[PDB]
């Protein structure tokens, strides 16, 4: 809650010209990112009017715009005619490879005469030409250019006298009313940790025919041959495969590296070495795809869960005169805390600089009331990148955890086994419990 007060709100009617003045109670208040429970309420004297606010989980949705389709892994098929006649040139009546149709330009591959190299392979003692044709993997992906992030949430105002009524201000519905009470969402304050710079990257969704969004990849424009003219880029086509620099003096599948498959396989290898993948959309979550699945949007939508604080400003205008704030102050306990690698490869520590840790913390509301809690990773040892605090609305008696874990970074590529952090837990002003995490960080390799 920002500040309460009394003000005479006058309304000069647009048609009648008559002004109607009524003294109202104008209360501006803060609604946190993780304020998903009925912890606090406001009581207005008019019998008291109980008003309580809750904010849905915040999401940063990016609009999709289809660009082109990209194949999972194109392949070179070396055809040896046996009749020793290969003629695959431009404006050719009948090439060995044959034209690809949706006649696609430069889809006829190339001929080569006499690791080994396209030409060197043709040289058989027993036999002297061969065609090199581009073929596509049965699986295709569709490339979508992500747009600008827009914060998607919903604020639920539960007005009660008796009979209860729910008001829903949000981003598309900034204002809401119910005769005695009219509330307006002004907007929220800036996030301390900005969103990832993914507002221009290309999202790779597999064209149908394991989990919804698990196979998805997000690629930088630097790794894509959009025109299909560059070599060894996601989208290298027939025009790039044919006309490649050396051609016959290069090993087969030469211009076919750096494809979706290759990048996917490379990312698996990164996860295996306890390093964060570079292309898999799970790089933002921390390993699990389940976090993203919880998003409300349609099949072709992309949104990341927001972990940074975004305090929404809501102004309430009540005809009632007098206000009181009532808040639940239930104690808590940290029922576990561990620093683990990407996708829970291992625990206890990570690789300095070349990788990052993920702080998973289990907490428990040790009371009879549903209360809001604040988890802080402070008083850390040398060269540890500070982590922004977290809010947790936890139900009475029940236990909770940070679904997207807190990312952990080190500002030195040093080898260590005794690195520490102080995991504090606060409830509605004062600290209820604290533990001391211990992370190891095996020095950066290369």
């Amino acid at each position: 809650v920002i500040a309460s007060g009394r003000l005479e709100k006058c309304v000069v009617d647009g048609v009648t010209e008559e002004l109607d003045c009524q003294e109202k109670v104008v209360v501006t208040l803060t609604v946190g990112n993780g304020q998903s429970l009925q912890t606090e309420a406001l009581e207005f004297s008019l019998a008291p009017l109980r008003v309580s606010l809750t904010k849905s989980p915040l999401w940063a949705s990016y609009p999709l715009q289809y660009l082109s389709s990209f194949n999972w892994k194109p392949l070179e098929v070396i055809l040896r005619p046996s009749n020793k006649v290969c003629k695959d040139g431009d404006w050719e009546d009948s090439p060995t490879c044959g034209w690809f149709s949706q006649r696609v330009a430069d889809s006829q591959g190339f001929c080569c005469e006499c690791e080994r190299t396209r030409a060197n392979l043709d040289c058989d003692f027993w036999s002297p030409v061969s065609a090199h044709c581009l073929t596509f993997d049965p699986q295709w992906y569709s490339g979508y250019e992500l747009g600008a992030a827009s914060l998607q949430f919903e604020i639920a105002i539960t007005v009660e006298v008796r009979e209860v009524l729910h008001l829903g201000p949000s981003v598309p519905l900034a204002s809401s009313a119910s005769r005695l009470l009219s509330a307006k969402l002004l907007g929220d304050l800036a996030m301390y940790t900005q969103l990832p710079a993914i507002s221009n990257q290309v999202l790779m969704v597999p064209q149908p025919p394991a989990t919804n969004r698990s196979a998805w990849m997000l690629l930088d424009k630097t790794m894509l041959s959009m025109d299909g003219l560059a070599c060894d880029k996601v989208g290298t086509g027939f025009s790039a495969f044919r006309y490649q620099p050396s051609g016959c003096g290069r090993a087969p599948q030469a211009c076919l590296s750096g494809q979706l498959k290759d990048l996917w396989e490379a990312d698996l290898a990164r996860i295996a070495d306890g390093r964060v993948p570079l292309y898999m959309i799970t790089r933002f979550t921390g390993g699990s795809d389940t976090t993203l699945q919880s998003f409300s949007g349609g099949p072709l939508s992309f949104a990341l869960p927001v972990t940074s604080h975004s305090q929404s400003l809501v102004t309430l205008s009540v005809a009632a005169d007098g206000v009181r704030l009532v808040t639940n102050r239930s104690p808590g306990k940290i029922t576990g805390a561990a620093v683990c690698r990407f996708a829970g490869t291992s625990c206890g520590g990570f690789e300095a600089v070349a990788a990052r840790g993920y702080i998973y913390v289990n907490i428990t509301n040790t009371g009879r009331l549903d209360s809001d809690y604040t988890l802080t990773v402070s008083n850390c040892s040398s060269n540890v990148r500070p982590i922004e605090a977290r809010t947790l609305a936890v139900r009475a008696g029940s236990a909770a955890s940070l679904d997207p874990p807190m990312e952990l970074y080190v500002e030195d590529q040093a080898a260590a086994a005794a690195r520490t952090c102080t995991v504090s837990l606060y409830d509605s002003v004062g600290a209820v419990t604290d533990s001391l995490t211990l992370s190891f960080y095996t020095n950066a390799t290369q």
Copy 2:
């Protein structure tokens, strides 16, 4: 308005050391993006002091920094010597193509004997790089800075403006001193253009219409790569195949090819990828309204950015007076980029543009809120809009509301509820109907 109150503001003078305490009325209040009219006012009791705030149209300006010049469409020119002698190599003083000037490296082009070489068989030929007369200057865009101005009209016939803005965070007028704290975060973030290269045609059409904004991936800055906006003499000569490649082989994907490809996108009811009009929705007129100089670039801000202004008045007592004029939605349509057609768009591969005409059906200039809510399945939510409309007069959303679908499904009965609110309650609502023909490819 955030919250009003009374506080004793004491000032310990820096030279005299004497403290001067005066009880003042401290009022913090928002100022919306589209609050360009005198709708609401504040009355302070000291005869009432009428104070009213307005915010100019918001713009996100990006600073320009010249990098290099880029040609419109470099062309390959094929010369057949007839004397059957092609002289084009490094150190050779009289090449067939001739050096470009002093002597630019690899400008001599290249030779092909017996696609380029296949054509010669009718016998050597010379392939020379030539440039289009039109050139464009490349400017690297910097970081966006929100540009606006808040006008505070203090009145007790005597009216006094006060202009707090981004370069002038504070303002005063003896009895009243106001400070712009800053505005809240936009719900829809700005487009990621803070590093792209702006292509302005070098002089010697409309002001900013010919302009293009290109990603750094589509520019060969060193002029060594092929088929990029910046590829030069050194790239044309030394191309992968060379003679075995068709004429105009290294010269694809230039400013002309990108512009041409973009007009084709608009034609197929798809948003262009390079034209600066991709942010507006078709019209260049929206951008022309920007205050800046010839070499400036700014995009109109459509997301809400509620500015926080704190007023300190020596007067004791405050009242808020607001105009509540009704409105009417005098039209609503979902149309393609640059008004190609209306009624619908192409699912995912394109986007719709909601154009809404409204009318202030009253005697007072009032603020209105337009919302596109209660939409059908897989429709991407659209953030609300504010409209300060003069009495009796009609208005429209100049930059239209962008419309997206979260499925590449073929549909003809897609719906949205366009509600119009005036200073708390809904005065009218319509029901838009969009068709989305499924994504092709």
Copy 3:
């Protein structure tokens, strides 16, 4: 200060179920980016003196190591004299000799031979070998910026109790007073788009962060398959398009050294560098050195306003605001090129000016000041105001200078701006800067 008021704050205990209501004074206030000094204070009724200060704001970007990169790979041309150059794969004794990095023979490290630009020089054979500069660099992919600061809330009864709410510690308390940092408002000038670029730190073994570069992903061959990029290998150097028909160092352009040198040439022509991390500051590396983080950290000083919202809850009933209002004087103002190449002006559009302003607190009290560059001539890009907390009698300056831009590539020598200095509401002095802009070349 936003708004003060009185409210009954009730606490329903989670275990005892008993509600405890206490009427408190709830004050929401604003702490500026450059509010480092004790200028203003709050007096709660013997008065309780409470004063807020905000540390210098920084935008830190998390590092993630990608790969290592050499300073300037060099081509060493060897002419064997015995006229025998045989450098191919699987040959045990090549002229260049194999490179060993993992105790094993690195592929394509043998270079290439040329008979009778690389072959024109020989005029009968020669070897072309790739060698590395002793200096190596480490490529780190920058992550998303996170604002790093600390708010210090001094409480005085007697006893000096100092509270520290910040980004990792949003809340703080001290029995009578409990404060919460809600968050700060959005910056008018957004941060530079560096959240995806690759930071080049030289591998150890002149100044900490001076040699550092920040490169766009377009300028690196990560797979090492492209020619003339920051990352082109032995493999890229060999198998190059022409080879023997191209001048030495043909596939070794645009390396770290090459870019660095190009940037010194830009600074020399009074233009802002494109790769040097000093492009954000204004020339000096000293500004960045002041950052609290570890050796492998990167943060830029925030010059745009970021007003933090802090709400104070005191059991005391009654509040008064006391502020120091010391006058000031602009003791110099100049528009200078990057890294102070020259002064008086800059190059229109192709470059930018840097407004350096010296100010002086001409009073007995430490006070907060506002510096504004307003009422400027035609086609001058507006500059956001600055806050300065200056100690009594002492002089101060804008450490990161105000960037100056022109919205026309016109030649002008009489361009003007009105530099105004405000102190805790009213303007105490004003000068009139005069910049020259020599028109854009090319």
